[PDB]
Every structure is written in structure tokens, then in C-alpha cells.
């Protein structure tokens, strides 16, 4: 209830109290794997394939992103979170007065070329960056030369100088001198002369002194970044304030590929390739990498590795966040053409409800046209991408996969054994001319089918979102509010509205409103409710009975 | 019951007895800290930021006032009480016949310039005050020259004189003389000639004598403040009564920055800066400073100091006033980036229910645009300002803080430890894309959670206002009244109405009216009542049960 | 009953008496074993695996903590208390003027590298700490240089000096000198100048002297820790107050890994590894180690050692605390693949009701993915962790263990013999396709089944908590209170409420309220009550009878 006016006034007036009340999940997907681009130990939100390609130049991670969106052409393309396992470092080369560092991480950055050239005609530096891999070749001409200072008085000579603070090595004053005595000085510490634009205007106001901004773009460099000049004759010719280092930052802070830093005097240097780019050895464990996905809001994670050790770390990670109120689930796959006996070993080792094992491996036709044969865990990306695109509580059972072929075409008996052992399998449907692949079931590694929440991904998924969303909403709404007499009624109304939305979105089957009871006593507020969970069909029984009928007339 | 007429009359009449009955907390915030303005050991009521800036030129105290109102944009901006710890003294300079003293206290007053100039054309002084810090430059022209006296008679000469009392050095008589003998005299002791306006009118009434008030404003100076003049020729030229000292007081008693006092003959002096301005050494203890806030009506106090000794003095101060019937509470913070171990030492030392410790420190964006990093106790100002703006019995739990960033982002485990030790902590919410900061709890230093009155600020706040308001109202109403037979019924009705208002304002949950019993015996009047206190939600338990449902048709 | 106002006043007033009454176990787990981190003979409260890993780098103790929480995925993860048996010592190296000591205890601390470098440009020290094991590498630049002092007067020279107390070697005065005579001095003993911040403000107030705080963070070092300087010229250049030792403490008292102490003049030294780290020989007896767990509030303890001597010490320890009013229980296991005959020897030696022996040993799949084969006593951690997570009075009978495999799969006859000898055994259930492991019984070493309190852990656990909780609550409530007439009734009401809560939580079966009798006579207060204890099902008898039924129509 926002009052009006906010400042109280004791004199007669009219006060208006404005009540703004009454008018006021995404299920993000995650991927971890090798890549040739992007910062290490950093999570990037992905919405289009173009963004991923620009960020991740190439690798298995980029293919996983492509396959995730292609698994569900008929559903919305959701967000994807990506990370580079490789501990890459940026290419750098210390030449001249500038410490050159490349924003690209890995061996690809070693091909970057950087060189400075001095234009004798304009007395300005020229930076050129060449990178053949991206076909990038641009020249930053007219570096420095921010503006001119000219003197038209009848005196013998006029000079100007710039003073720098010893501690910070930043310009602090700009004194205009005619003859010996000082005429006027501008303080560059701050305030009135934060930027050079104010300095130019004041110079023109003087009778004899004049100044003009350079035509090569609107620089507007800070006054503190001006270079050190002393005893420069103005009357003979116009003197250009260089500020070479400041101009580079403006044109390279958020543009180009190469960044620059100051160690020294900046001078031209020949075109030389950068060095030091190294992807580095692969990480010993992925536990540190997974921790960065803790508060990113993702639900499904598909580690792009066939190692059983990597699967165990992800299995513990999803369990850890679920215990902390941020449930997650994992889908993994083992190697190339693994047999049933090998798959049982992987499933027995994990035995986690929040982990699913994918057996089938096959070949997928990419956008480039490659019939790239991929291992099992790349198939899990399609299942994970399909699962993320589906609504809350939906299942991936009997859904299409859109796979060109599979290494192993399991028979009916083989599929049953994998299902009994809690392993996801993909069957080639030969019952129709238009043959296609489909997922037999979304069963988890936890083989106890008595508990459908743990056994079935879809049932557990609805429980997690239902429980998690209710947990967050209640805290923001009711905690910290007064325990008024109508608190119990308000809480009951909020619960019914929340459950009604779930029924509206088919996230739950139904709930009895009468059984929703709220008890408030002191700080505690006990709540009890009944909900009929949503379930996915997995068995249809038909009892066909034949009977006789008598005809007449 | 006001009678009418108030004077009794025994003759036949009609008397009317008029009964005017039946038709007939702010929670002010307090701040103490360094400042560059305002009198020492003085409490000033603040309602707008402009008033504080004019009073307090600059310092950490002014920033605290700005932060207090900015912490709750959605609530009313309440009053703030401010004090300057520095024992500043006023700048002064004894030059000429006037003792010059500056109303501004501190080193800033040393820049004040004061000078007198004499206008030969008008024979009047001219005062000019220059103060470059405020860009203040005004001239008080035509000092003195209150009025004229003229004589148009045919006699040879006419003169007037003014006599002053030796003991008081104040004018007592004003005699108009023609030739040698006296014509008429005006007594300036008092009564008919308290002010000079009456003197001017009487002079004009005479045949030959005339007078006119000066056109340079309506002075109306007192007759006692007139200057001493003897044997002044009137016929040759009009004589101006100067009264130089009296005119200065009229134009400077409640205007300008500089005050003046008389030590001596007043004469012009050159423009000279004042001296003696000194903020002084900081106080050894704040106990004397806090005593001035005893009867100011404030509830929340936030000492702007990180010293543990200062916190202890405020901890004792709030306890002292609570024992005297004026409860108060304190919020403090320790230094920059203090660790958990340091915070436990501060909390253990105090162990006061009426004191709260703030751990987090961060940076706030001020109205000027400065990203000023501030210590923990400045964050307490936002909590104190937020608490003051909230209604009675409300809590600051889970409320927003509007802070740019925090030095330490405590994890979930770290926040629990601080809460268990009775320390307020601020958490960065990463569960949503629109991340924001919030207060986990308003727990006090007293760790005994069994007593929510002492442990919880909101619960104790409601108890203090409920108890304090009831204490004051009963004394003003019932003490001193007759113990009539219906006294018990009237007291019971008053209690029910008072408790009904609390329920109306949601300051209490509910009360049973039947249990309210009043017993009157002699001077004593025993009262017993039951009240269900208002409480803030801090735990919500949900028991979700899944069940099967059968569908048909 | 808190009165209001607390200070009595004899004048007429209104007094309010506030009665705050009417509005006002965890079963912690314990572990002892080898570890590569943490202080010796210290108990640390553990709530997350991340905290344990940071504290305990590696060892069997860390695995036990991981296994304890993983044994009960469906129950709350309770607190765990951990201790390092190894008498490790911290690595240290006396080089230069600083005594370097490492907070990490053991041989791992020997890899820590510490080195000081002097920055000629800023005249400030630079500390760098390298520790490859944690990949920790940070540089504490700009050590010292707390603030500057500058003089702008027209005098010939200005100097300042610092005086130190001989007894304490702490700064006491800071004198500013111009020419020969002293101008002003600041007393650093205490009070007005406890911290350097007050000194800086006062210096700026002077006409000529100026000072500015260093920009490299908010240090605010104490004035007593300032370094000794004498006869330092100020006019020529600004003089930096170093205080090298004080700055190190601020940045390392509660940050970093390495602590520092002063023996001497501090000077730079080359990068050198620390020495003296030694885990030490293992303790001869664990009796001293167990004493630290006396008042930590734990109930279950699992010594991570197969030695029979270690088991006996823990067996005596739990008995000792139970006699003192702090009951505890122990679970132990013997070696690898011990036979039945060996297990009988261990059980016969102990014969303690508060000790349980675990026979089975097997392999557990850790979060890292290791199929680590472990001895029997590591299995007891899962049982102990499962028992701690269960409610009060619950049993671990027939509960799942979640173990990959067991060394010995006991037959039906073998399990009965172990149960008859009071030894816990784990059976592989082959009666279903979804085979799993379960605990046959929670019988203690005390084979006398006639006393279920001693024989059964669950029954004895309920008795201990019921007796212990009642013991503590009665002392805090009734001891020290007056023996009023209604004391017996109040005690009876308290007992009924306490027993009602136990029935509400299913900690007891039922109690008759009528039989609760309270007798008060003098100091003594005799109490008598009847309680039906809660019991766990261990035998179900079914009497199935077949009969004939006649049908008609």
C-alpha cells in the first residue's frame, strides 16, 4: 500500500493510499563437454545456434547443442547452459609498451596477429589485427590525435604543458602559457573537466586560443588519460594531443578480438603472432566444474563423457542440489556399442533415482550433412533436449527420436530385460511401412517400480517442480507478514489458487479443496493438502467380449 | 463540563452546561555521528533532506539521513533526530566596537568575511558579508538613519539632545530645545513611547517641528536603543538619528549568517576573515551525547561508530530509558568486512535484547551518484530507517534492502550460524533471474529464542508500544478522578475500546473481552486483561499427501 | 513477570506487569578416525560434505562422513561430529623478522611457500603465498603505506616522529614538528585516538598539515601498531607511515592459509617452503580423544578402528557418560571377512548393552565412483548414520543398506546363530527378482533378551531420550521455585503435557493420566507415573483356519 504524498504533512490536505495488489518453470537444459572457445569455468546462456558457434568455435559440445534443439522440432527451443571443461589460457605477447592479450582461449588464439604502424603524414599510430580463421582484418587508423590547440594572438610565442600525478601517473592539470607567465589552467582532477569535451569548449571561449575536435569519430576521452607534454610550441603549428593509450581502450574495450594493457613508452612494432595459447591438460575430476551450475536454474544435465567416474560425480551433484532445495536430474550414456552385461554394471554402480542410463548409440545427420556416428551419451542429449522442451509432468515415452540408424537393433526380449534393469532403450518399429524409432520407457536407474516418483522421470519431475515452486512462493509471500486473524483464510485461498493453476496446466490430475486445512500457531504455520498426481499411461487392458444378437423383419 | 455563564448570578436566568466530551505512535528515528554543521549537543527534528543539508553541511551523518529515507521508497518518510558529536565552537573576531560571532560551528566558519564601510553621501554605515562556500554575498546598505527631525520656525536656532541612563546605558529622554529653554520632551522609559513610531507622530503634530520615517524599510526600532546625541543643530540641516547598533540587530537577529554584539564606539573596519573556528577533539565517551535524546520521543537509534565501547554505551542508554518508561532499541554494525569470529565477540559482549548487530557491509549508490563503500553500521541505518517506516508490530524479515553489492556473500550454512548466534545477516538471492538482497531475520543479540519478546524485534516492539501507550493514556484519564460507583465500568469500556483499536490496526491478534476484569479498592485500581500477541511468520510446514483417484465414463 | 517501569516511583502513576509465559532431540552422530586436516583433539560440527572436505582433506574419516549421509537418502541429513586422532603439528619456518606458521596440520603443510618482495616504485612490501595442492596463489600487494602526511607551510622545514613505550614496544605518541619547537602531538595511548582514522581527520583540520588515507583498501589500523619513525622530512616529499607488521595481521588474521607472528626488523626474504609438518605417531590409546566428545551432545559414536582395545575404550566411554546423565551408544565392526568364531570372541569380551557389533563387510560405491572395499566398522557408519536419521524410538530392523556387495552372504542358519549371540548381520534377499540387502535385527551385544531395554537398541534409545529429556526439563522449570499450594497440580499438568507430546510424536505407546501422582513434602518432590513403552515388531503369528461354506440358489 503505497501512500501519497510520501512526506507527511500536518496541515489540512487530502491523502490517497494506493494499493497495487490484485493486478501484479522454464526447465533450462545444461551441457558440459570439450570446446574450442569460451572462458573456462564459466556458464553461458544460449538461445540460438549462431551464438553458440560464435562462442564455441567447434567440438563435441557444439554438436550436442545442435542435437538438443533438433530432437524436438515440434516444441519450443529452450535455453541451454554450456561450459568448457578444458582449462584453456589466453594467448599473449609482451612487445613494445603494450601487454597484448587475446580474448579467445586455446590454441586457436595463437594465430592472432597484432602490429602497430606510425603514419608520418598525420603523426598517428595505426593498429592492424589479422586473424585468418575468422577472415577478420580491420585497421584502426588515426589512433590518438584527439584534438588541436591553436594560438592566434600577436604575442611572440605560446606554449602549453600537461602535469601528471606521481602516485597515479594520471594527468591532473593542463596549463596554457603565453610568454613566461601562465594565462589559464584547467584542473583535470574531476568535476567540471571530467571529459575532454568541456576542455575544448572553454578553450574556444578565450580570445586568442582555439580548439577543434578531431573528425575521426567522437572519442570524448577522459582528461585523466591524456599524455604528458611539456613546452610544445603552438603558434608555429597546431599541436595534437596524442593520448595514444586512451584511444586504444575506447576502440578495443568492447570491440575487436584483442585487448591491450599498459606495462613504458608505446612505440610501433612489427606484425607478430601471439603465443602462450594452450588448452591445457584435461581436468582430473569434474566436481569443480559442476559447482558452477549450482545456482544457474537448470534441471537436466547431460555430461558428454563415457567415463563411469564422471557419471558418479554428476550423480552426486544432482543429489546435493536436491537436498539443498534445487532438484536436478542427469542422463548419461556409455561408450560405443556397449553390451547388456556392461550396461548392468553401470546401472548397478549408480542406483540413483535422479540418474538415467542410455544404452543405444547411433548416427545423426547434422545440419552440415555429416553422418557423424556418436556414442550413447550423445543420444542422451536428444532425450534431454526433448525432455526439456516437453511440458511439466510429460514423459518421453514412445516419442520420436529422429535418428538415422542405431548400432544395435534390440529385439522384443532384449528391450524387456533393459527395462527390467532400469535402462532406457530405443526400439526400431518394424510394424509399419513408415518405420521409425521411439523410446520404450523413461525408467530411471532405481529399479524399485513400487515408488513411481523415484522410478519414473515424469512423475518425479512433476513432484520436484510442484514441491520446489510451492516452497519458493510461500516464503516470498507469507514469511515476515503479521499473523492476523485472517491469515489462515488468506493462506488457504493462496493454496487453492496455486493448485488450480496446476490443474489448469495439467501438471496435476485433481485436488480436493475441502481437505486443504491450514493451522496457524505462533511462528509456525502448519499446512495440510491432498493432491492426485498426474501419471503417464504405460499399460492398457482391454476385455473384449463376444455375444450373440438376434435379427428380425 | 464547561458551564455558561462562568460567573454565577443569583438573579433569575438560564444556565447551560456544555459537555465537550465524546467529540474529542510515530516511532521517530535517531542518528548520531560526525557532521560539519549544527550546534553541539543539540537535537534537531528533520523532515526533508534539504533541511538536513542546510543544517549539516556534509559528513557521514548526512549520508546516513539520505540512506535512511532511501531504504523504504514504498513507506512514509518519518522524522529523524540528528546530533553532532564534534564539540565545535563558533568563529569570532573582535574588531572595532562590535564582537563578531558566526552562527556556523566548525572550521568552515573561518572563511566568513565581515566588513563595515561608511557612505559619505548618506552618512550611513554599510555592512557586507562574503562567504564563498555558500556563494553568499549581500550588502546591508543604509545602516542607521532611522528618521529625520526638521525645524521650520522663525526662531534663531533649534536643537535636540538624547539622555541615557548611566546604569543601563539606554536612552531615556528625547528633548526638543528652541533657544535656551526646553519646549517639549519625550520620555523613552516605556509605555506611550515604547517604539520610535509614536515619537515620529507626535513630532509632526507640533507647529514647527517635523519628522519623516526613513524610506529604507520599516525599521521601527525601540526608543531605548537610540544613540546619544547632544547639541545638534536642526534649522541648518535635517539631523539623522543614527542608532547604528540597534539597526544591525533588526537586520541580523534572525537573518544572515553572522551575529553581532556590543563590547566602545562603533567605527568602520576593513574586510577581515573570522578566526577561532575549531571542530575540537572527538569526545572520549558518547554517554553525555545520548542523554539529550532522553525525552525526544525516539525509539530506534543507530550510532555511526564501529567502536565496541560506543556500542556498549548505547546498549546501556536504551536499557536506562526502558526502565524509566521510555523504551528504545539500538542497531549497530562492526567495521569493514568483519569475519564470523569477530562478530561472535561483539554479540557475546553485549547480550542485550534491545540491541541488534549487523554483519554485512556493502556499497550504496547515493543521490550524487557515488558508489560509496560504507561499513556495516551504515547498513544498520537502512534497517533502522526501514524499521521506523514500517507499522507497529511489523518485521524487517525478508524485506528488500536496495544495496548495490555486499563485501561478503554468505552461503546457506554461514547464514544459519549467524542466525543461531543472534546476528542479522543479508543474503544474495540467486534462486531467480531478478536477483536481490533480503534480510533473513530480525533476531536480536539475546540468543534465547524461548522468549520471543526479547529474541524478536517485531514482537518486542509491539509489546513496548502496547505497554507504553497504555501506561500514558490511563494516567491522563483516570488518575485524579473520583472513585464513583461506575468507575469500574468506565475503565472496562476504555480498555475494550483501546484494545479494539489495536485489533483494527493489526497491532494485536485478538483479545477476549469477557476476561477483562477491573477491581477498584481505595486508591488502587487493579486491572487484568488477556491479549493474543501479533506474531511474524518464520516457519511454514506443508504435509503433501498423494492419493489415487478412479475415473469412469 | 516483567514489571513496567522497572524503576519504582512513589508518585501517582500506572504500573503494568507483563507476563510473557504461555507464548514461549537432534540425536547428533559422531565419528573418530584418521584424517589429513583439522586441528588435533578438536571437535568440529559438520553439516555439508563441502565443509568436511575443506576441513578434512582426505582419509578414511572423510569417507565415513560421506557414507553416513548416503545410507539414508530418504531422511534428513543430521549433524556429524568429527575428530582427527593424529597428533599433527603445524609447519613453520623462522626466516627474517616474522615467525611463519601454517594453519594446516600435517605433512601437507610442508608444501606451503611464503615469500616477501619489496616494491621499489611504491616502497611497500609484497607477500605471495603459493600452495599447489589447492591451486592457491594470491599476492598481497601494497603492504603498509597506510596514509600520507604533507606540509604546505612557508616555514623552512617540517618533521614528525613516533615514540614507542619501552615496556610494550607500542606507539604512544605522534608529534608533528615545525622547525625545532613542537607544534602539536597526538596521544596514541587510547580513547580519542584508538584508531588511525581519527588521527587523519585532525591532521587535515590544521592550516598547513594535510593527510589522505591510502586508496588500497580500508585498513583502519590501530594507532598502537604504527612503526617507529624519527626525523622524517615532510616538506621535500610526502612520508608514508609503513606499519608493516600491523597491515599483515589485518589481511591474514582471518584470511589466507598462513599466519604470521613477530619474534627484530622485518625485511624481504626469498620464496622458501615451510618445514616441521609432521602427522606424528598414532596415539597409544583413544581414551583422551573420546573425552572431548563428553559435552558435545552426541549419542551415536562409531570408532573407525578394528582393534579390540579401541572398542573397549569406547565401550567404557559411553558407559561413563550414561552414568553422568549423558547416555550414548556405540557401533563397531571387526576387520575384513572375520569368521563367526572371531565375532563371538569380540562379543563375549564386550558384553555391553550400549555397544553393537557389526559382522558383515563389503564394498560401497562412493561419489567419486570408486568401488572401495571397506572393513566391517565402515559398514557400522551406515548403520549409525541411518540410526541417527531415524526418529526417536525407531529401529534399523529390515531397513535397506544400499551396499553394492558383501564379502560373505550368510545363509538362514548362519544369520540365526549371529542373532542368538547378539551380533548384527546383513542378509542378501533372494526371495524377489529385485534383490536387496537388509538388516535382520538391531540386537545389542547383551544377549539377555528378557530385558528388551538392554537387548534392543530402539527400545533402549527411547528410554534414554525419555529419561534424559525429562531430567533436564524438570530441573530448569521447578527447582528454585516456591513450594506453593498449587505446586503439585502444576507439576502434574507439566508431566501430562510432556507425555502428550511423546504420544503425539509416537515416542511412546500410551500413558494413563489418572495414575500420574505427585507428592510434595519439603525440598523433595516425589513423582510417580506409568508409561507404556513403544516397541518394534519382531514376530507376527497368523492362525489361518479353513472352514466350509454352503451355497444356495
From TrEMBL, chains A, B, C:
Region annotation Disordered: where it falls in the sequence: 1-23
Organism domain of life: Viruses
Protein name, per record: Major tail sheath protein
Amino acid at each position: 500500500v503505497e501512500p501519497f504524498p510520501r512526506r507527511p504533512i500536518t496541515r489540512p490536505h487530502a491523502s490517497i493510499e494506493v494499493d497495487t495488489s490484485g493486478i501484479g518453470s522454464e526447465k533450462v537444459f545444461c551441457l558440459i563437454g570439450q570446446a574450442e572457445g569460451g572462458e573456462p569455468n564459466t556458464v553461458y546462456e544460449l538461445r540460438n545456434y549462431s551464438q553458440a558457434k560464435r562462442l564455441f568455435r567447434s567440438g563435441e559440445l557444439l554438436d550436442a547443442i545442435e542435437l538438443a534443439w533438433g530432437s524436438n522440432p515440434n516444441y519450443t527451443a529452450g535455453r541451454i547452459l554450456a561450459m568448457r571443461i578444458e582449462d584453456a589460457k589466453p594467448a599473449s605477447a609482451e612487445i613494445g609498451g603494450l601487454k597484448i592479450t587475446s580474448k579467445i582461449y586455446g590454441n586457436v588464439a595463437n594465430n592472432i596477429q597484432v602490429g602497430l604502424e606510425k603514419n608520418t603524414l598525420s603523426d598517428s599510430l595505426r593498429l592492424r589485427v589479422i586473424f585468418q580463421d575468422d577472415r577478420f582484418n580491420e585497421v584502426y587508423d588515426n589512433i590518438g590525435n584527439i584534438f588541436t590547440i591553436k594560438y592566434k594572438g600577436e604575442e611572440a610565442n605560446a606554449t602549453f604543458s600537461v602535469e601528471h600525478d606521481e602516485e597515479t601517473q594520471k594527468a591532473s592539470r593542463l596549463v596554457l602559457k603565453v610568454g613566461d607567465q601562465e594565462v589559464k589552467s584547467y584542473d583535470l582532477t574531476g568535476g567540471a573537466y571530467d571529459y575532454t569535451n568541456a576542455i575544448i569548449t572553454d578553450i574556444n571561449q578565450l580570445p586568442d586560443f582555439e580548439a577543434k575536435l578531431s573528425p575521426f569519430g567522437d572519442k570524448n576521452l577522459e582528461s585523466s588519460k591524456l599524455d604528458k607534454i611539456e613546452n610544445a610550441n603552438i603558434k608555429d603549428k597546431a599541436v595534437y594531443v596524442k593520448a595514444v593509450f586512451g584511444d586504444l581502450e575506447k576502440q578495443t574495450a568492447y570491440n575487436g578480438i584483442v585487448s591491450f594493457e599498459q606495462l613504458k613508452t608505446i612505440e610501433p612494432f612489427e606484425l607478430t603472432k601471439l603465443k602462450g595459447g594452450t588448452n591445457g591438460e584435461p581436468p582430473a575430476t569434474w566436481a569443480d566444474k559442476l559447482d558452477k551450475f549450482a545456482h544457474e536454474g537448470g534441471y537436466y544435465i547431460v555430461p558428454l563423457s563415457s567415463k563411469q567416474s564422471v557419471h558418479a560425480e554428476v550423480a552426486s551433484f544432482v543429489k546435493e542440489r536436491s537436498d539443498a532445495g534445487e532438484p536436478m536430474r542427469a542422463i548419461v550414456g556409455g561408450g560405443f556399442n556397449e553390451s547388456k552385461e556392461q550396461l548392468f554394471g553401470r546401472q548397478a554402480s549408480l542406483s540413483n533415482p535422479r540418474v538415467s542410463l542410455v544404452a543405444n548409440s547411433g548416427t545423426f545427420v547434422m545440419d552440415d550433412g555429416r553422418k557423424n556416428h556418436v556414442p550413447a551419451y550423445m543420444v542422451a542429449v536428444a532425450l534431454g533436449g526433448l525432455a526439456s522442451g516437453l511440458e511439466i509432468g510429460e514423459s518421453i515415452t514412445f516419442k520420436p527420436l529422429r535418428v538415422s540408424s542405431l548400432d544395435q537393433i534390440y529385439e522384443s526380449i532384449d528391450l524387456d530385460e533393459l527395462n527390467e534393469n532400469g535402462i532406457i532403450s530405443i526400439e526400431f518399429v518394424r510394424n509399419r511401412t513408415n518405420t521409425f524409432f521411439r523410446i520404450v520407457d523413461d525408467v530411471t536407474t532405481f529399479n524399485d517400480k513400487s515408488d513411481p516418483v523415484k522410478a519414473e522421470m515424469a512423475v518425479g519431475e512433476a513432484n520436484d517442480f510442484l514441491v520446489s515452486e510451492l516452497k519458493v512462493q510461500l516464503e516470498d509471500q507469507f514469511i515476515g507478514t503479521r499473523t492476523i486473524n485472517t491469515s489462515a483464510s488468506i493462506i488457504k485461498d493462496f493454496i487453492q489458487s496455486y493448485l488450480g493453476r496446476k490443474k489448469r496446466d495439467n501438471e496435476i490430475q485433481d485436488f480436493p479443496a475441502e481437505d486443504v486445512q491450514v493451522i496457524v500457531e505462533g511462528n509456525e504455520a502448519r499446512i495440510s493438502m491432498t493432491v492426485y498426481p498426474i501419471r503417464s499411461f504405460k499399460k492398457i487392458s482391454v476385455s473384449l467380449v463376444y455375444k450373440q444378437q438376434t435379427l428380425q423383419a
